[PDB]
Coordinates of C-alpha atoms and ligand atoms in Angstrom, one line a residue:
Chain A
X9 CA 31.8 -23.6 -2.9
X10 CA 28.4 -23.7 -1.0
X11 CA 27.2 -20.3 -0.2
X12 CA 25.2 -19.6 -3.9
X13 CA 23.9 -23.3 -3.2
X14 CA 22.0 -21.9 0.2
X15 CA 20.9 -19.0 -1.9
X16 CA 20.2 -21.5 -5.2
X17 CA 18.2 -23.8 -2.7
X18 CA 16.4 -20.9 -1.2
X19 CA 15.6 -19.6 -4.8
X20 CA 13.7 -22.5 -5.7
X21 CA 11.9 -22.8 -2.1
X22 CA 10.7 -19.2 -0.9
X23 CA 9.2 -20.4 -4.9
X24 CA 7.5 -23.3 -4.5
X25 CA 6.8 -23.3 -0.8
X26 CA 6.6 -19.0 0.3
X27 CA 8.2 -17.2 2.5
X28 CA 7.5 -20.2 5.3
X29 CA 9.9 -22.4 3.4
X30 CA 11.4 -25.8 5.5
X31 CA 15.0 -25.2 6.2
X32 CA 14.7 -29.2 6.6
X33 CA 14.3 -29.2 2.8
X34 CA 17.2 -26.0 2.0
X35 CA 19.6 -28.4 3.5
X36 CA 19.8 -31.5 1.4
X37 CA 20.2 -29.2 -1.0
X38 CA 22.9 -27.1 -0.6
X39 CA 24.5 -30.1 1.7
X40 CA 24.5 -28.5 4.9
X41 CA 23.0 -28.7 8.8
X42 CA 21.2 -25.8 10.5
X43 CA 23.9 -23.8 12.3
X44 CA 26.0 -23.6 8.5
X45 CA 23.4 -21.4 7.3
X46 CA 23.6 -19.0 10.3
X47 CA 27.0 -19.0 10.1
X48 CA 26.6 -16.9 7.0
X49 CA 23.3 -15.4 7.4
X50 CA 22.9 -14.8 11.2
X51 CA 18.8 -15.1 10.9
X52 CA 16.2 -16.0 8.9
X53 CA 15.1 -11.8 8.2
X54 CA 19.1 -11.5 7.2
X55 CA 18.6 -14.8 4.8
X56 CA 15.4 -12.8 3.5
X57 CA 17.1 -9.2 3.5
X58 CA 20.3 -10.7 1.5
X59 CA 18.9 -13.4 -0.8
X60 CA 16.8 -10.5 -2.3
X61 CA 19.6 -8.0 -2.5
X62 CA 20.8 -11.3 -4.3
X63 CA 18.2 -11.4 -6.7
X64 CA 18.1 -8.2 -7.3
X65 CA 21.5 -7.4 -8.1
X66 CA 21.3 -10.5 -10.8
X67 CA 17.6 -8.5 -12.4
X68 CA 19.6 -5.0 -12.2
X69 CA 22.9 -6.5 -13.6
X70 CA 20.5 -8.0 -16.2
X71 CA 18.9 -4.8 -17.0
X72 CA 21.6 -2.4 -17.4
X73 CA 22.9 -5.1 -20.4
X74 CA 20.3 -4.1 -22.0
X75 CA 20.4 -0.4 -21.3
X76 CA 20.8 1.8 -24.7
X77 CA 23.1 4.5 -23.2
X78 CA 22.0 7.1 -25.6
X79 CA 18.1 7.8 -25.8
X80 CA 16.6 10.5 -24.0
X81 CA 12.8 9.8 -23.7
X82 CA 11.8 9.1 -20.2
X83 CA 8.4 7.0 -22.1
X84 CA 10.8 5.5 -23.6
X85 CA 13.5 4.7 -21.3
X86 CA 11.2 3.2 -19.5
X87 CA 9.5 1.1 -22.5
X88 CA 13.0 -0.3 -22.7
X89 CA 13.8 -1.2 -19.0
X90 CA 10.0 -2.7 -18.7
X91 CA 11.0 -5.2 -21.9
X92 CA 14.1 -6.0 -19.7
X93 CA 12.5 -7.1 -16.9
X94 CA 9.7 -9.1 -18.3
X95 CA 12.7 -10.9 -20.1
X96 CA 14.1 -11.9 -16.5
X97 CA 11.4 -12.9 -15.3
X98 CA 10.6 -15.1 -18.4
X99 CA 13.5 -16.3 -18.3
X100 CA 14.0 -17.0 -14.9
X101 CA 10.3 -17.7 -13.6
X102 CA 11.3 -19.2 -10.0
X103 CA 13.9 -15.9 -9.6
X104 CA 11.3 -13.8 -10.0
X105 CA 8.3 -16.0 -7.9
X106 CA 11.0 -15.4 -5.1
X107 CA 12.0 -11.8 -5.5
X108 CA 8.4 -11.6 -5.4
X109 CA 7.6 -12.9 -1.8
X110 CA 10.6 -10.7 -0.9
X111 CA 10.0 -7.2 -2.3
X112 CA 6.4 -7.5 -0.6
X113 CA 6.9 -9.3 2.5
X114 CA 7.9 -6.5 4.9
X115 CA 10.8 -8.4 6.4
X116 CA 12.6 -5.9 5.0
X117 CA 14.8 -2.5 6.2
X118 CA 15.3 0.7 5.1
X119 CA 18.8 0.1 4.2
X120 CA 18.0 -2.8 1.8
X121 CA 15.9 -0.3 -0.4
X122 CA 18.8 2.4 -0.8
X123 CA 20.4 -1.2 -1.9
X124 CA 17.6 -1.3 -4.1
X125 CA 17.4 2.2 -5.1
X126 CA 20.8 3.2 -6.1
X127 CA 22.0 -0.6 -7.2
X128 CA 20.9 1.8 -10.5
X129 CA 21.3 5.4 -10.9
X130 CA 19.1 5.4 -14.0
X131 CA 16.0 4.0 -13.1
X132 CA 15.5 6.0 -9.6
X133 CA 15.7 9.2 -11.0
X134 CA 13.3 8.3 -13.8
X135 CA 10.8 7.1 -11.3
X136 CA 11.8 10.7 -9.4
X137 CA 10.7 12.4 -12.3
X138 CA 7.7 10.1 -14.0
X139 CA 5.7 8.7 -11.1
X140 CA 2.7 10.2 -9.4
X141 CA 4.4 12.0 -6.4
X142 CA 1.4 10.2 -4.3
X143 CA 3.9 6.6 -4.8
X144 CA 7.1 8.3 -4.2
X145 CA 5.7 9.2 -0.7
X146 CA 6.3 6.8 2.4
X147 CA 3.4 6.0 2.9
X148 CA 2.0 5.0 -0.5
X149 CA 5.6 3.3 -2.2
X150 CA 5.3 0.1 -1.2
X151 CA 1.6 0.3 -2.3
X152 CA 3.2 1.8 -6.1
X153 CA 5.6 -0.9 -6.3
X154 CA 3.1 -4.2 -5.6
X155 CA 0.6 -2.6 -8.7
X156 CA 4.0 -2.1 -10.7
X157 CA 5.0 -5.8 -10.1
X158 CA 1.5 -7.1 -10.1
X159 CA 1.3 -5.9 -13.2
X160 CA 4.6 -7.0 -14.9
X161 CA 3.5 -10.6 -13.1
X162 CA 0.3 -10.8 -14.9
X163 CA 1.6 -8.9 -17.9
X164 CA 4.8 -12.0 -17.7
X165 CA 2.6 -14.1 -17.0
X166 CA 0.2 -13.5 -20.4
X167 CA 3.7 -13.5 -22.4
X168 CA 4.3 -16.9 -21.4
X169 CA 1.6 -19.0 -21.9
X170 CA 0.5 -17.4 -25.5
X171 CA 4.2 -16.6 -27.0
X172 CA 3.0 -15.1 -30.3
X173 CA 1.3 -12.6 -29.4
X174 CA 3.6 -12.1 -26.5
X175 CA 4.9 -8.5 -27.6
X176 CA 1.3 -7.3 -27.7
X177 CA 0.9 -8.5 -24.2
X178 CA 4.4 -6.5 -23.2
X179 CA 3.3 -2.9 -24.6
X180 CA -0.2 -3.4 -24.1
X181 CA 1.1 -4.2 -19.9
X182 CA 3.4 -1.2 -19.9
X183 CA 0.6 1.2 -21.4
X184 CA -1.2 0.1 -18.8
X185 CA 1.0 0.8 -15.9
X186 CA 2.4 3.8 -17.4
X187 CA -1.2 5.7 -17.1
X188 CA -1.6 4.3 -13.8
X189 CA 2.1 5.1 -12.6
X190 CA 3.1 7.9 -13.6
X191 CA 2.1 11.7 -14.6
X192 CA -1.0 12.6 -17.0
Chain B
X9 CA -25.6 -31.2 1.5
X10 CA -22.1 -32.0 -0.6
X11 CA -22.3 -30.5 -3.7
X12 CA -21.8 -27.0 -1.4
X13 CA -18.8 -29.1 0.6
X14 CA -17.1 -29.7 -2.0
X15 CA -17.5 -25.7 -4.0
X16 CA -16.3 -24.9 -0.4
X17 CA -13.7 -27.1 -0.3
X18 CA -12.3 -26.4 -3.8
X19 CA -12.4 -22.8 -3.1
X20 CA -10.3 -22.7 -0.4
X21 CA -7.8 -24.8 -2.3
X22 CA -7.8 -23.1 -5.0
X23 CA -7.4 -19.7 -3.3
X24 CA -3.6 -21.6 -1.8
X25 CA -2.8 -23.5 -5.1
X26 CA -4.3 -22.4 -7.8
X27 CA -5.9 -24.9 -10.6
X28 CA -2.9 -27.0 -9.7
X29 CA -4.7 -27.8 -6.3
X30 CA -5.2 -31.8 -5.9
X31 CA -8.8 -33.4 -6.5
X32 CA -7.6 -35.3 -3.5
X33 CA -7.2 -32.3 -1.1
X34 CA -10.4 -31.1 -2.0
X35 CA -12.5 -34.3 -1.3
X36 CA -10.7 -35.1 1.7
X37 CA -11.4 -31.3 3.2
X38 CA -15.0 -31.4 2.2
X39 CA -15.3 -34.7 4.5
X40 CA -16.2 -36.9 1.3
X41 CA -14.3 -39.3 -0.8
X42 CA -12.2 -38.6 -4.3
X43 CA -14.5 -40.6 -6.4
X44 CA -18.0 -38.8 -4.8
X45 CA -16.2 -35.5 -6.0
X46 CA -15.8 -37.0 -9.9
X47 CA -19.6 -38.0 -9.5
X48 CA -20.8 -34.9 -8.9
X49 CA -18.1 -33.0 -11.2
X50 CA -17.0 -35.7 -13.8
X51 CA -13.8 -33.3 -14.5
X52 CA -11.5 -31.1 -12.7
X53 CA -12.5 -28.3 -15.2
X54 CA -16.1 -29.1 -14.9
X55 CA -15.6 -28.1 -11.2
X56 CA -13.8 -25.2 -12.1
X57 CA -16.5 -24.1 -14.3
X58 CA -19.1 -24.4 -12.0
X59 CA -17.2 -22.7 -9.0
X60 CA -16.8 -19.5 -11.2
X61 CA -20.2 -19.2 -11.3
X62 CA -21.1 -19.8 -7.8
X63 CA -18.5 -17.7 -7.1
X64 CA -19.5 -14.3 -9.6
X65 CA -23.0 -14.9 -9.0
X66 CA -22.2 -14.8 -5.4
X67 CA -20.1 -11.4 -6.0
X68 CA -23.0 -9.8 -8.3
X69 CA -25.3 -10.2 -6.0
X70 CA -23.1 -8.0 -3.2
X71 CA -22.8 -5.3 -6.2
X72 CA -26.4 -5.4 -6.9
X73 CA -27.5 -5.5 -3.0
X74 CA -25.1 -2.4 -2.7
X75 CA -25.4 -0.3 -6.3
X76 CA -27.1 3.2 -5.9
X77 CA -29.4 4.2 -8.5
X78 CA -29.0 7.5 -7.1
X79 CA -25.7 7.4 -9.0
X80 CA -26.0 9.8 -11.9
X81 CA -22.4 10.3 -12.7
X82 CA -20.7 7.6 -14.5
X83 CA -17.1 7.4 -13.2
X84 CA -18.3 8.0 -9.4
X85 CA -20.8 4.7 -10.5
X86 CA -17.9 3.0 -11.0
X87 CA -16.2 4.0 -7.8
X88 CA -19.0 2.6 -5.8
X89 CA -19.1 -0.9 -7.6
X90 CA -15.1 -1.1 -6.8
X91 CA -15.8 -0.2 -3.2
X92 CA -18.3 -3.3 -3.0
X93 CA -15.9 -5.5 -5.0
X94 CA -12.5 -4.3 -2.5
X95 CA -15.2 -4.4 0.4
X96 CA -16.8 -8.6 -0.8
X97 CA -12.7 -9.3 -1.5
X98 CA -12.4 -7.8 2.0
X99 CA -14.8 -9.9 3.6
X100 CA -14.4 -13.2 2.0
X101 CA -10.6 -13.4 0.9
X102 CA -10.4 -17.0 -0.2
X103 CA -13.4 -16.2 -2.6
X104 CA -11.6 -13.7 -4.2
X105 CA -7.9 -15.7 -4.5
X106 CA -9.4 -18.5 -6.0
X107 CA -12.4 -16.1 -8.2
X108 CA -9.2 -14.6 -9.5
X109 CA -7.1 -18.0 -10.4
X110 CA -10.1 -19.6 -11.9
X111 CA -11.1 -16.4 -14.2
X112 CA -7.9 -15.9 -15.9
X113 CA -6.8 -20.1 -16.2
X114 CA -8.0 -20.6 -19.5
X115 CA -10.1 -23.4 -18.5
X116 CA -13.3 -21.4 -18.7
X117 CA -15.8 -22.2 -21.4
X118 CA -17.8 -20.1 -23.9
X119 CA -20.6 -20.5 -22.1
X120 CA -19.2 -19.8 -18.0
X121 CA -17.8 -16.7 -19.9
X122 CA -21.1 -16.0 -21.4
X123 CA -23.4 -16.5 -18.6
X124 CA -20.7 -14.5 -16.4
X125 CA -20.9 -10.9 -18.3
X126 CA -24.6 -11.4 -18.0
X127 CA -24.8 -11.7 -14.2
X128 CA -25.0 -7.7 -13.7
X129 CA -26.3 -6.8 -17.2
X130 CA -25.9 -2.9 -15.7
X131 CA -22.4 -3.2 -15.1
X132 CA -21.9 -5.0 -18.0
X133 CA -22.9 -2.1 -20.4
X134 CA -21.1 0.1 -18.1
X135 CA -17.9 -1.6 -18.7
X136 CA -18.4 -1.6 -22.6
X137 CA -18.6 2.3 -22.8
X138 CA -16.2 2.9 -20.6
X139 CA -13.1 0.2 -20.9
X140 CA -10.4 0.8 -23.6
X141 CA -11.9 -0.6 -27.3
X142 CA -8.8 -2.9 -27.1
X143 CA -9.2 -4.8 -23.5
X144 CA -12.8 -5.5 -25.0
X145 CA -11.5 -7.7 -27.6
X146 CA -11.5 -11.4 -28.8
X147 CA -7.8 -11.3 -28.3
X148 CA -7.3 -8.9 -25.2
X149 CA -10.3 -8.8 -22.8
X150 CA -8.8 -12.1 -20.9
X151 CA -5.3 -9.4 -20.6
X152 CA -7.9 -6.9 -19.6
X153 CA -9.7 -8.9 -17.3
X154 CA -6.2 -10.3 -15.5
X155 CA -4.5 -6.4 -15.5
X156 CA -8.0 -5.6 -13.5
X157 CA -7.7 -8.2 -11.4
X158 CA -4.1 -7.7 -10.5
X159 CA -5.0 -3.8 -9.5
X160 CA -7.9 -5.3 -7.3
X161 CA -6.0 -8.0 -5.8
X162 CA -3.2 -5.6 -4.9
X163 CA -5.7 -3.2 -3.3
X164 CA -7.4 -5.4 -1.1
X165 CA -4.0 -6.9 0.3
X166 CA -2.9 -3.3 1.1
X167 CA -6.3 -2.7 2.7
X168 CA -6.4 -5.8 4.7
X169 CA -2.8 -5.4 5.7
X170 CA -2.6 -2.1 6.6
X171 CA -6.3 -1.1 7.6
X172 CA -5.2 2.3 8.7
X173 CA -5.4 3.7 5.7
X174 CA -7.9 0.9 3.7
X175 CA -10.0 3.9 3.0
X176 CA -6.7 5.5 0.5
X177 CA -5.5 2.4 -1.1
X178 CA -9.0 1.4 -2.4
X179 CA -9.5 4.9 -3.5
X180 CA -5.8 5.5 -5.0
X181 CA -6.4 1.7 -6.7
X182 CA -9.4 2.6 -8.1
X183 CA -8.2 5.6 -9.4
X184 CA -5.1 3.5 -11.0
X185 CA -7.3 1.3 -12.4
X186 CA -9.3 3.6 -14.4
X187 CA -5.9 5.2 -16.2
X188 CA -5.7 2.2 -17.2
X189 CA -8.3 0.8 -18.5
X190 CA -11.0 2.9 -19.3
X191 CA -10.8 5.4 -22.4
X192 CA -10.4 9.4 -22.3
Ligands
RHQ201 C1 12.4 -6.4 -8.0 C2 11.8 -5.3 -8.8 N1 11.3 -4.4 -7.7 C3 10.8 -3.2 -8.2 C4 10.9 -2.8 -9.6 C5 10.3 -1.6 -10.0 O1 10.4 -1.2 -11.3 C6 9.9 -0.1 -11.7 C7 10.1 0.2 -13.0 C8 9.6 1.4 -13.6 N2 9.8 1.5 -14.9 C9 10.7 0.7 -15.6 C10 10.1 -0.6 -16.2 C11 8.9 2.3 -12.8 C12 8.3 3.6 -13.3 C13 8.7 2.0 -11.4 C14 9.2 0.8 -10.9 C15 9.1 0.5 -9.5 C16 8.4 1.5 -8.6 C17 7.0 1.4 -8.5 C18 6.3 2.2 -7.7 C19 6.9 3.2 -6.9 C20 8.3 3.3 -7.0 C21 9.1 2.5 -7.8 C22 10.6 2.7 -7.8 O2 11.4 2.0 -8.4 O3 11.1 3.9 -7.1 C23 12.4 4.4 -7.4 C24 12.7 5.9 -6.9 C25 9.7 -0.7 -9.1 C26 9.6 -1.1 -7.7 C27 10.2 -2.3 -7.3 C28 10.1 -2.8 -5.8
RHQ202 C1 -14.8 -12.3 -10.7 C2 -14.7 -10.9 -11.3 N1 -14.5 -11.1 -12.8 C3 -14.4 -9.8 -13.5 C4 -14.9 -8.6 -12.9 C5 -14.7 -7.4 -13.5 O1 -15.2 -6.3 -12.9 C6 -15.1 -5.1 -13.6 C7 -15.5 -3.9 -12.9 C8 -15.4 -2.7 -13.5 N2 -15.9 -1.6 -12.9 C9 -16.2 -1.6 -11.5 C10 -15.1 -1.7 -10.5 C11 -14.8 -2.6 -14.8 C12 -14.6 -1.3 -15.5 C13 -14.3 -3.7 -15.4 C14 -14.4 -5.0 -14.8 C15 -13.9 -6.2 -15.4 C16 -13.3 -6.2 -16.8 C17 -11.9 -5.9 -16.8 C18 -11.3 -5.9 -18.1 C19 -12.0 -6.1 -19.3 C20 -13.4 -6.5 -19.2 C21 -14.0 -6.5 -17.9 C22 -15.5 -6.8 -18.0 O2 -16.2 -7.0 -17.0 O3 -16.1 -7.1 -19.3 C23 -17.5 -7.3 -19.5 C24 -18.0 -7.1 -20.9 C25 -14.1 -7.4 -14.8 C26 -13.6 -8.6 -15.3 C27 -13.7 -9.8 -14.7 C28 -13.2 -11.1 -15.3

């Protein structure tokens, strides 16, 4: 009865305020002093580690709702689960402004990704087999995944603020990351 | 002497806040007061005209300074002009983070826009031949111009955070950005 309003006040203050947010503040939300927070997530990395494994979870659990069990197209498969997440991310703009900070902010371990990575079977596999072996490498991933994101960002970003021509702005964004992602 | 305080000022808030960024902030970190700033710029979106232009015109003329005729060879042409772009983004990263807020904050008029493609009338044929028909167009190029942006942005934050390998992720961005925009 409190935990989800330490991860609902961090939500909407990594947002506002990046990844420096005021724990002064995260308190008087979620009604709590210092030590309560770190007696469910030991540091602030943990906080930063958990509250996007968080935010994930909610953008996967979203996405596999969506998820047409039955077409075979990896183009296509992945036309679908790019609508998906722009759809998050429209819909929750402040979710995504946070998972945002997170995915790129290095504060991150190794573990969290196989988290992030198997959380869904379908995607990780497509990725094995669509994207440019140069951003599967561990060197150049985290580079693949901030153009991905960049460009779903601008691409939700376009969506929002001109809504009827927002499904021009969708496939025209996933066109564009598709040739820039993924095999020719 | 206040005039360039003032761009100065309003660039690095922009760069932190966006258009968002207070009138108020901006006067006070230039050293003058509010109501000098709304002499000199009698709306917020007169400023942000007029800093877009500073700004490109101060970006062109890097490109300019550092474009080799020699260049024969049309995608390596274009190479080189992103390597001067990553390198003045580089060099001057509150330039860029506001140059990139202001350009896609439809705010801009007809005019900025205007006098802004015609800054580096080389470049500016270059991009017509080689950029997809559609990110040319009344309704797209502003898209276009943010999906470009995005891939830039991206690759100097790479670059600048992991210098090591600068040299790869402005090569491997450049050669993301051209899958996706340009035509086969
Ligand atoms: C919070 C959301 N976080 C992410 C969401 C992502 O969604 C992705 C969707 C894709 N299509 C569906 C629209 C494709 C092709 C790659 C994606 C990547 C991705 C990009 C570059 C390299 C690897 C991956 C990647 O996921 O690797 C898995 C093996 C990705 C990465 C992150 C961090
Ligand atoms: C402050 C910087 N402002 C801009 C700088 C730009 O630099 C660009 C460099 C390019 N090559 C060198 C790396 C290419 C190919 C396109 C570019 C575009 C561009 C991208 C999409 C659609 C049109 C254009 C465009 O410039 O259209 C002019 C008609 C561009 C756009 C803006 C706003």
């Amino acid at each position: 009865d409190k935990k989800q309003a330490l991860l609902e006040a961090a939500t909407q203050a990594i947002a506002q305020s990046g990844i420096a947010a005021s724990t002064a503040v995260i308190a008087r939300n979620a009604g709590v002093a210092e030590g309560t927070l770190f007696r469910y997530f030991a540091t602030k990395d943990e906080l930063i580690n958990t509250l996007y494994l968080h935010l994930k979870q909610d953008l996967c659990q979203s996405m596999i709702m969506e998820l047409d069990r039955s077409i075979t197209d990896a183009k296509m498969m992945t036309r679908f689960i790019w609508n998906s997440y722009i759809s998050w991310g429209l819909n929750h703009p402040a979710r995504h402004r946070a998972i945002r900070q997170l995915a790129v902010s290095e504060k991150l371990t190794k573990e969290t990704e196989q988290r992030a990575d198997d959380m869904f079977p379908e995607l990780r596999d497509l990725c094995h087999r669509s994207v440019l072996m140069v951003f599967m490498s561990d060197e150049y991933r985290a580079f693949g995944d901030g153009l991905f994101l960049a460009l779903a960002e601008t691409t939700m970003d376009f969506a929002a603020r001109d809504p009827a021509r927002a499904g021009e702005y969708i496939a025209l964004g996933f066109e564009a990351m598709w040739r820039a992602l993924t095999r020719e």
